[PDB]
Short mmCIF file of C-alpha atoms and ligand atoms in Angstrom, two decimals:
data_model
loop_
_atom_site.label_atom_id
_atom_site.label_comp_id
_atom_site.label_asym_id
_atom_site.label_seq_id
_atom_site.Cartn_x
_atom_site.Cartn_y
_atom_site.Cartn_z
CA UNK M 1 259.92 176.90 -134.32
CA UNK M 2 263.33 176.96 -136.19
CA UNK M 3 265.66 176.02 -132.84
CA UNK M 4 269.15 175.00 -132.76
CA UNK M 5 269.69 171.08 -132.68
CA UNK M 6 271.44 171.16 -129.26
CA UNK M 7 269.04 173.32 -127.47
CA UNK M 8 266.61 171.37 -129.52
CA UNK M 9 267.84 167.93 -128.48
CA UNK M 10 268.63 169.11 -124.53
CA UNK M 11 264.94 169.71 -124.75
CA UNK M 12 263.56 166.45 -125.89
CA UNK M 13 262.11 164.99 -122.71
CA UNK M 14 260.92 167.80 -120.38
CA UNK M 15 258.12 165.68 -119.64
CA UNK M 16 260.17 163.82 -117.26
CA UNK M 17 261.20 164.11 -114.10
CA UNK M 18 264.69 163.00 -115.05
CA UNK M 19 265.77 165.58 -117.25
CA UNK M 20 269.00 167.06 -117.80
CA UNK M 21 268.53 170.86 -116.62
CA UNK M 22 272.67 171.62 -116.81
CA UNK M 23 273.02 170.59 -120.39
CA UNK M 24 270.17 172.75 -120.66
CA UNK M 25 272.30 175.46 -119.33
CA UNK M 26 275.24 174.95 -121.34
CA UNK M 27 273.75 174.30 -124.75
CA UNK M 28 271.90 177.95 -124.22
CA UNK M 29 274.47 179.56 -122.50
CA UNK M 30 272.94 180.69 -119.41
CA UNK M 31 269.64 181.34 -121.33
CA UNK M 32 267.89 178.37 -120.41
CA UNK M 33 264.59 180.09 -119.00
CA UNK M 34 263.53 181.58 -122.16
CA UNK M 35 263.89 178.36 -124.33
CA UNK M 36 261.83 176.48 -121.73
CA UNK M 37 259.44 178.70 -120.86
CA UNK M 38 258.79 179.06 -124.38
CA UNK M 39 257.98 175.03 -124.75
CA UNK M 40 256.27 174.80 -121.65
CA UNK M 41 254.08 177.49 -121.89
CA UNK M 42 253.01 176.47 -125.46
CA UNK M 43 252.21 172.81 -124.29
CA UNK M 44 250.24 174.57 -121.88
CA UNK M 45 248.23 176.72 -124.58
CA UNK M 46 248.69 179.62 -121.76
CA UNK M 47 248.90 182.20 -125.06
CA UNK M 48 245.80 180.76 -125.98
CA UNK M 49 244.38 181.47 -122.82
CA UNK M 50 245.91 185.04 -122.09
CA UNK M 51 245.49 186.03 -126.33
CA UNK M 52 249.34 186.90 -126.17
CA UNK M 53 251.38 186.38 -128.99
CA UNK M 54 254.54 184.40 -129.29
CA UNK M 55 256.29 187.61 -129.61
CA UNK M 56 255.17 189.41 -126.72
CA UNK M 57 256.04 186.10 -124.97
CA UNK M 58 259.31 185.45 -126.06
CA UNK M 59 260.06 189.55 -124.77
CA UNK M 60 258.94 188.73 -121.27
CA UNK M 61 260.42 185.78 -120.71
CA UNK M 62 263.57 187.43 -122.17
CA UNK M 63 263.17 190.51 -119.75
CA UNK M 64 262.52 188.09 -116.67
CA UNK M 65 265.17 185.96 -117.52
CA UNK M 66 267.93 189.03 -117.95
CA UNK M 67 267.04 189.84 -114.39
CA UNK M 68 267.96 186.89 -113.05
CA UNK M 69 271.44 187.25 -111.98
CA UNK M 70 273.83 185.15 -113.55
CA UNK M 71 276.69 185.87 -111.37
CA UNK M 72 274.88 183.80 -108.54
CA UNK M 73 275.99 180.38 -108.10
CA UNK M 74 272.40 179.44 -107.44
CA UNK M 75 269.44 182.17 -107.25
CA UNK M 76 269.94 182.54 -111.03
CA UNK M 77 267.97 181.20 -113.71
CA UNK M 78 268.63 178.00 -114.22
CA UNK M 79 266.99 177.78 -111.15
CA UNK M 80 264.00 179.42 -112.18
CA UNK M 81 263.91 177.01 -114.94
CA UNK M 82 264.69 174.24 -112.98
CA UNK M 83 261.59 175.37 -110.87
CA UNK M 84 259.39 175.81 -113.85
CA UNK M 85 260.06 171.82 -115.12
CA UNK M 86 259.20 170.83 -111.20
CA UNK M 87 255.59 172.88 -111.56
CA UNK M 88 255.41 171.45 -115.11
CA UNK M 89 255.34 168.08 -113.94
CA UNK M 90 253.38 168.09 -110.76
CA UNK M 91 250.82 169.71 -112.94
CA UNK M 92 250.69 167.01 -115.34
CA UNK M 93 249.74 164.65 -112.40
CA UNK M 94 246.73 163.25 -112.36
CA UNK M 95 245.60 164.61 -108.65
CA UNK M 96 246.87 167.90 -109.81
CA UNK M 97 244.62 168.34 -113.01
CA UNK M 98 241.25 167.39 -111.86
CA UNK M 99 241.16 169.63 -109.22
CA UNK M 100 242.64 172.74 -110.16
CA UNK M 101 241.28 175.38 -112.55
CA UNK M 102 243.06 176.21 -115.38
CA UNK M 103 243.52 179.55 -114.40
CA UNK M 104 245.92 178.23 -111.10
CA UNK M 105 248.04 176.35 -114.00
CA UNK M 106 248.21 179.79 -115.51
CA UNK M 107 249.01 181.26 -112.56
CA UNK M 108 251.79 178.25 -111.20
CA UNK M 109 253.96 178.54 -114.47
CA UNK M 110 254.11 182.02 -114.44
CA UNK M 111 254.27 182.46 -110.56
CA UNK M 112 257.42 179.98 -110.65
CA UNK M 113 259.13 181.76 -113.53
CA UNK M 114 259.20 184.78 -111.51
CA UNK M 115 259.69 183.67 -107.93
CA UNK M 116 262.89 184.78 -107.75
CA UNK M 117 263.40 187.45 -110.32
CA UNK M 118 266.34 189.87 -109.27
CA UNK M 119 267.51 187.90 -106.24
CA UNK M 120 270.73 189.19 -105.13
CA UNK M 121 272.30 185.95 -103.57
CA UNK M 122 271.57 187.24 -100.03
CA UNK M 123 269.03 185.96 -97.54
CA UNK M 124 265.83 188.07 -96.12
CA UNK M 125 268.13 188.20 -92.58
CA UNK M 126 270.69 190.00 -94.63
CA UNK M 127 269.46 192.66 -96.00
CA UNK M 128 267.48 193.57 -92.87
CA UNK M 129 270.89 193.48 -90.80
CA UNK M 130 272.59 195.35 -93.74
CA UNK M 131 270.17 197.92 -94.13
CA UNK M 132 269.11 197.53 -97.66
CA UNK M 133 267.48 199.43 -99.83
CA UNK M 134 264.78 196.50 -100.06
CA UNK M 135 264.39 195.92 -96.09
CA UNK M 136 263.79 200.01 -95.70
CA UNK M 137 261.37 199.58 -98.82
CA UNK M 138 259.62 196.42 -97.43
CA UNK M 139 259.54 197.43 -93.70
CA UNK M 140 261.81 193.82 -93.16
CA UNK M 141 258.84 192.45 -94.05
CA UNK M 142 259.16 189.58 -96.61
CA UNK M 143 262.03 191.84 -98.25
CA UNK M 144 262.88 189.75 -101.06
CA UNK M 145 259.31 187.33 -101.61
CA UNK M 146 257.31 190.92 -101.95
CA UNK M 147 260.28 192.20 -104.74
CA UNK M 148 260.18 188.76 -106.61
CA UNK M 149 256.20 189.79 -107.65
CA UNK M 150 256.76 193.62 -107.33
CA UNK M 151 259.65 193.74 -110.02
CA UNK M 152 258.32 191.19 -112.14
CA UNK M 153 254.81 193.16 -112.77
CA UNK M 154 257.03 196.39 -113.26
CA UNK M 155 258.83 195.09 -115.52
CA UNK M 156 255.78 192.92 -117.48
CA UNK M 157 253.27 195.96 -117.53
CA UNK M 158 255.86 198.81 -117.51
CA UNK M 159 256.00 197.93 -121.64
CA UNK M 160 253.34 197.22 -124.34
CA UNK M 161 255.74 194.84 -125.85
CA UNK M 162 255.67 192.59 -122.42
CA UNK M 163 252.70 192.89 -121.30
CA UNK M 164 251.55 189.49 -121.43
CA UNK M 165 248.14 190.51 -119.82
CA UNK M 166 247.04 193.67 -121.68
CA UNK M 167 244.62 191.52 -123.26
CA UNK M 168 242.32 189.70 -120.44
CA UNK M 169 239.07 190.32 -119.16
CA UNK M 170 239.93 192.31 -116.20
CA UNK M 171 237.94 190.05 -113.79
CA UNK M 172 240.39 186.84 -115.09
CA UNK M 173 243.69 189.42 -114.32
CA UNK M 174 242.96 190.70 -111.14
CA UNK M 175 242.10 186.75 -110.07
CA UNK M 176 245.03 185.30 -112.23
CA UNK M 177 247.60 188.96 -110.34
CA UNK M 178 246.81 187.57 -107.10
CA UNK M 179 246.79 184.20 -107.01
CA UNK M 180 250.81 184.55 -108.98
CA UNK M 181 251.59 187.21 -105.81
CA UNK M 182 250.33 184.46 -102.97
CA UNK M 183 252.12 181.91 -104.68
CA UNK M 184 255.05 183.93 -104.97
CA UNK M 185 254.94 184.84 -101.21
CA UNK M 186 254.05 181.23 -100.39
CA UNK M 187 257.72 180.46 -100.73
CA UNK M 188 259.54 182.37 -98.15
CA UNK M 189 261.54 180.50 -95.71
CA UNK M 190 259.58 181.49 -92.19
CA UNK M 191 256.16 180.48 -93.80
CA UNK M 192 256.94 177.13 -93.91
CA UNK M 193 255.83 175.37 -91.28
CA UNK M 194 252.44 177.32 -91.42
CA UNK M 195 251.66 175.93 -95.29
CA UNK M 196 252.77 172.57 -94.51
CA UNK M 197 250.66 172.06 -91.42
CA UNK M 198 247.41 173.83 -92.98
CA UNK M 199 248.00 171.58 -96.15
CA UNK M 200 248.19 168.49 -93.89
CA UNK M 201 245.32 169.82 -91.78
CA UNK M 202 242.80 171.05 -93.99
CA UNK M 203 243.57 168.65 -97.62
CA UNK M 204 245.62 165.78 -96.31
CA UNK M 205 243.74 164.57 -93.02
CA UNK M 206 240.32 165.12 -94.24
CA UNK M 207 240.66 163.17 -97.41
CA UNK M 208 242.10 160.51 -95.72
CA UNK M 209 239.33 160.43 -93.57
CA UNK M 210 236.71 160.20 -96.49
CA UNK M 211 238.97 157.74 -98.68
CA UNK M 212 238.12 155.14 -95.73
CA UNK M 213 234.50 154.94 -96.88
CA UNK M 214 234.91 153.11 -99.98
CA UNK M 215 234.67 154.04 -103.74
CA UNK M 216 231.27 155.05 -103.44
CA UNK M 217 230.28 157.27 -106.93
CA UNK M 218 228.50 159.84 -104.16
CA UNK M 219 231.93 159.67 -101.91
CA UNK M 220 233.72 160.72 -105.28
CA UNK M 221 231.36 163.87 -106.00
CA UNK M 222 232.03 164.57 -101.96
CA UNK M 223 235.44 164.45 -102.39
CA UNK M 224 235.70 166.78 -105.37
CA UNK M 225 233.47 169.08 -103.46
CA UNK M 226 235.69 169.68 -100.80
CA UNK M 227 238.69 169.51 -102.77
CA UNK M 228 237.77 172.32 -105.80
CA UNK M 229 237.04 174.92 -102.70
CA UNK M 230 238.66 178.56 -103.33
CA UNK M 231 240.78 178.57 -100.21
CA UNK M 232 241.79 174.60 -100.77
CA UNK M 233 243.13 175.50 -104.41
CA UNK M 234 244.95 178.01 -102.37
CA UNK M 235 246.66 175.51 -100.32
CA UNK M 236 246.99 173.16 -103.32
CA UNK M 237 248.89 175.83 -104.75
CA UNK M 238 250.83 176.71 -101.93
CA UNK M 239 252.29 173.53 -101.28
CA UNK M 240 253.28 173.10 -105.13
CA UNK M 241 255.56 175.83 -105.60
CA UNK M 242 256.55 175.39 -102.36
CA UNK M 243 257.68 171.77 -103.22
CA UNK M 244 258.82 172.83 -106.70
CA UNK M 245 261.22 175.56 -105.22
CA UNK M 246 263.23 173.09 -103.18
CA UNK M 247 262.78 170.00 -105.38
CA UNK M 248 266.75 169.69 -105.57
CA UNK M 249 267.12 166.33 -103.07
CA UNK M 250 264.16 164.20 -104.83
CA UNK M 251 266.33 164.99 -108.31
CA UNK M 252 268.69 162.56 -109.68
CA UNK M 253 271.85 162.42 -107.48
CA UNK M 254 274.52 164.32 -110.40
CA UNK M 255 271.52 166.94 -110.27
CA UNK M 256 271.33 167.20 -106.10
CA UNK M 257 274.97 167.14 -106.17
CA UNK M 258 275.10 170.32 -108.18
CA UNK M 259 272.36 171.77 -106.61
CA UNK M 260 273.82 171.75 -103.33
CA UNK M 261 277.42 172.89 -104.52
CA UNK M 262 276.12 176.01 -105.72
CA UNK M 263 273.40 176.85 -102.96
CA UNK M 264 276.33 176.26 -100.41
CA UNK M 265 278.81 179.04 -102.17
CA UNK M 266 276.27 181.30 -102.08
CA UNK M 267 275.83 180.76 -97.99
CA UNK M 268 278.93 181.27 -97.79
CA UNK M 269 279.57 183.88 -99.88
CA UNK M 270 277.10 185.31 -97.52
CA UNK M 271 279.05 184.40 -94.35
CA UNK M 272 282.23 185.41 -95.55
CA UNK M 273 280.43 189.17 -96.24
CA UNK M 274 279.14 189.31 -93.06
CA UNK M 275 282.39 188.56 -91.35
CA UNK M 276 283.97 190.94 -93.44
CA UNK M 277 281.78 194.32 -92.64
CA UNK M 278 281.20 192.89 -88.67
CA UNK M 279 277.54 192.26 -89.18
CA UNK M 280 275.87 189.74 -87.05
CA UNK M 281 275.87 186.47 -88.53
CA UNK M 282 272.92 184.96 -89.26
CA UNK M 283 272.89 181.22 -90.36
CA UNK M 284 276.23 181.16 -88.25
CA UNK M 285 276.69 177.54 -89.65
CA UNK M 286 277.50 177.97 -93.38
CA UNK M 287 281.12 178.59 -92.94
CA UNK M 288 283.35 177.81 -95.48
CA UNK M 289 285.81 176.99 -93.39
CA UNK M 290 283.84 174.63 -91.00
CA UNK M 291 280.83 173.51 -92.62
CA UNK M 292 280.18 169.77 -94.40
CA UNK M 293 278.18 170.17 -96.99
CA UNK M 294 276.80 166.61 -96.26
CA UNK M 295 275.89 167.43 -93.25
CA UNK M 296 274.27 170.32 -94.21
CA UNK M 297 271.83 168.65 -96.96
CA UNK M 298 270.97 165.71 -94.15
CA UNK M 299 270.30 168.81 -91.82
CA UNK M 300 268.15 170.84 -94.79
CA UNK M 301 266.13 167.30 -95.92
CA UNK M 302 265.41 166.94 -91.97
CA UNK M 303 263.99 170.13 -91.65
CA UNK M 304 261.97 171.15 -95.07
CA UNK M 305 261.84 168.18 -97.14
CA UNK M 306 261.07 165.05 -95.34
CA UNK M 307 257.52 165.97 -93.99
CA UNK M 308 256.58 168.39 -96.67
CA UNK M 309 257.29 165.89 -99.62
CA UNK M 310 255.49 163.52 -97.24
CA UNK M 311 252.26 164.91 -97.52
CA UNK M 312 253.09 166.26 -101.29
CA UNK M 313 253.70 162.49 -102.68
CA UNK M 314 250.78 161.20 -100.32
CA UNK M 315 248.11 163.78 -102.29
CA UNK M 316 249.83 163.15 -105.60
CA UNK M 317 251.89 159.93 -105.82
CA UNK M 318 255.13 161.19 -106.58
CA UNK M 319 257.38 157.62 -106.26
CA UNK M 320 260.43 158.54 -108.57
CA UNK M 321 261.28 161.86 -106.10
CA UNK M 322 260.45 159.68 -103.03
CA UNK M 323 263.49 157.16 -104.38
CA UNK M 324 265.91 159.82 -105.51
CA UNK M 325 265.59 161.37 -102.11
CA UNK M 326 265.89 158.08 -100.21
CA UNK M 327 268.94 157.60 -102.28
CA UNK M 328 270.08 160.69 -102.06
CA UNK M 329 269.68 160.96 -98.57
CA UNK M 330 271.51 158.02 -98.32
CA UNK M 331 274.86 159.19 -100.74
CA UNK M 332 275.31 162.51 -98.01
CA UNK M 333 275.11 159.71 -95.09
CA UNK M 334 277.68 157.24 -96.95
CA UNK M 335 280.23 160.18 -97.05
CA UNK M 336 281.70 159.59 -93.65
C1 LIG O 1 267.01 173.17 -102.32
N1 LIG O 1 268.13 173.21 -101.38
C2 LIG O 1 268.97 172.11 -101.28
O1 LIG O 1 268.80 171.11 -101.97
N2 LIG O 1 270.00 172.19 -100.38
C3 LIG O 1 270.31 173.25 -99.54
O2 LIG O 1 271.27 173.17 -98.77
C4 LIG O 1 269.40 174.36 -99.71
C5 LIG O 1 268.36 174.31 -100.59
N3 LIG O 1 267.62 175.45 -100.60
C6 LIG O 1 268.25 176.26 -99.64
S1 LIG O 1 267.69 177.85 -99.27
C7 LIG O 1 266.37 178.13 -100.50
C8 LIG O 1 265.91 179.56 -100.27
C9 LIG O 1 265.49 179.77 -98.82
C10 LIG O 1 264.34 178.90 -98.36
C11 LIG O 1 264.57 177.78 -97.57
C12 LIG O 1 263.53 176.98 -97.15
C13 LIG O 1 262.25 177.30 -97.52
CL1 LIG O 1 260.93 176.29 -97.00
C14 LIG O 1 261.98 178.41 -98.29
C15 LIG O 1 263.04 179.21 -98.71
N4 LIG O 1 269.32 175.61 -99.11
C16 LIG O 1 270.33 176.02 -98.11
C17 LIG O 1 269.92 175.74 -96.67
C18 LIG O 1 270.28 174.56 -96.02
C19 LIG O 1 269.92 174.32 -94.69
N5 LIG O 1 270.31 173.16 -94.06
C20 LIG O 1 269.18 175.29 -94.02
C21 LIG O 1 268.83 176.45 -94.67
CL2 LIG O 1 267.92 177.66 -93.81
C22 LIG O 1 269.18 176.69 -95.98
MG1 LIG O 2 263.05 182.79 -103.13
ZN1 LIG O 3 263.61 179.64 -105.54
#
């Protein structure tokens, strides 16, 4: 397709993990979703697979992508695109392709271009202390996760011209709807723990056990057998978006730089808000006025990263995010 030569040449290597997301950005003018999704869903053949034209997808990803909102330093999306190239590339990996289904790639690339459709800026904590709309519709129940995959199939089969499923076997969509909504509700914050322990538990520890007897051809077919289950590609899954949404640290350092800048403002942004109408403040710690943003990123890679990318790169191999976060890590510690 006909593209401009900037957009064209900011889009060169997506293949990579070191890729240039923020030129990206500026070369499309906040429209970098559309002109990414559009590459990485042809290399995937997902058209093909879902007998959607390029028109009807070129509408949806434009509809997604105008809900994203721009105004947010972060939740916007250029991080949804950002989170696409992560799921891009950990499905490429080898580990990754011979045990999921086609189908769960189908289901990744569209479950992380959506994740975070129509995010307001504003944590789950907030809106159920303010009273939202969205907590009184969602019970304060996974307020924003359950919106991120509500809106997003309004919006795609709420018009003929974006539904990009109106053509499936109806078996395929109701397996390829719910395994987007349980990735898409795999990534809020309080589930963490939960996935990362049942991934270490049920995919990490037993493989390990099994890889200690040898590279028998019979240990192979064993290991695929236990691998492939239904409920293991759900973990599999899980743990992919989950490391795809906060990928930021194992990025190149000009990348995690900018990453954290602009999840930071929008903490608080929050703070400031809550100050400001005497609601109770939630993550009392992102204060503008107080809080070291160093600090903060050696708190958040303490917390989420370090074991969950632990088990992620020991299932995959990931090396190049393991070094960027060790060096990484390592730039917020020199900065004192
Ligand atoms: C990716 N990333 C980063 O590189 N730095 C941050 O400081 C950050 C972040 N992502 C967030 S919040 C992402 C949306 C909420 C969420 C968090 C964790 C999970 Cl597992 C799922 C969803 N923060 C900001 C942040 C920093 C610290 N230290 C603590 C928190 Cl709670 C949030
Ligand atoms: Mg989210
Ligand atoms: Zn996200």
């Amino acid at each position: 397709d006909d593209v401009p030569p900037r957009i064209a040449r900011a889009m060169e290597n997506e293949e990579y993990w070191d890729f240039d997301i923020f030129e990206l950005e500026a070369a499309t003018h906040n429209r970098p979703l559309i002109y990414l999704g559009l590459k990485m869903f042809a290399r995937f053949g997902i058209c093909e697979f879902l007998h959607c034209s390029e028109s009807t997808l070129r509408s949806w990803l434009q509809i997604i992508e105008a809900n994203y909102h721009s105004s947010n330093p972060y939740h916007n999306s250029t991080h949804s695109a950002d989170v696409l190239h992560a799921t891009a590339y950990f499905l490429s990996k080898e580990r990754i392709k011979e045990t999921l289904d086609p189908i769960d790639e189908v289901a990744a690339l569209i479950a992380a271009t959506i994740h975070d459709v129509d995010h307001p800026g504003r944590t789950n904590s907030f809106l159920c202390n303010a009273g939202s709309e969205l907590a009184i519709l969602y019970n304060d129940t996974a307020v924003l996760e359950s919106h991120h995959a509500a809106l997003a199939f309004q919006l795609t089969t709420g018009d003929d011209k974006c539904n990009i499923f109106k053509n499936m076997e109806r078996n395929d969509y109701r397996t390829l709807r719910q395994g987007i909504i349980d990735m898409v509700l795999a990534t809020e914050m309080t589930k963490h723990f939960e996935h990362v322990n049942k991934f270490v538990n049920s995919i990490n520890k037993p493989l390990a056990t099994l890889e200690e007897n040898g590279e028998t051809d019979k240990n192979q077919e064993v290991i695929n057998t236990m691998l492939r289950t239904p409920e293991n590609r759900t973990l599999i899954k899980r743990m992919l978006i989950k490391c795809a949404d906060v990928s930021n640290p194992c990025r190149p350092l000009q990348y995690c730089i900018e990453w954290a800048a602009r999840i930071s403002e929008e903490y608080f942004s929050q703070t400031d808000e809550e100050k400001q109408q005497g609601l109770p403040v939630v993550m009392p710690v992102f204060d503008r006025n107080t809080c070291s943003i160093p600090k903060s990123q050696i708190s958040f890679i303490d917390y989420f990263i370090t074991d969950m990318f632990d088990a992620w790169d020991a299932f995959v191999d990931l090396p190049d995010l393991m070094q960027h976060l060790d060096n990484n890590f390592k730039y917020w510690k020199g900065l004192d």
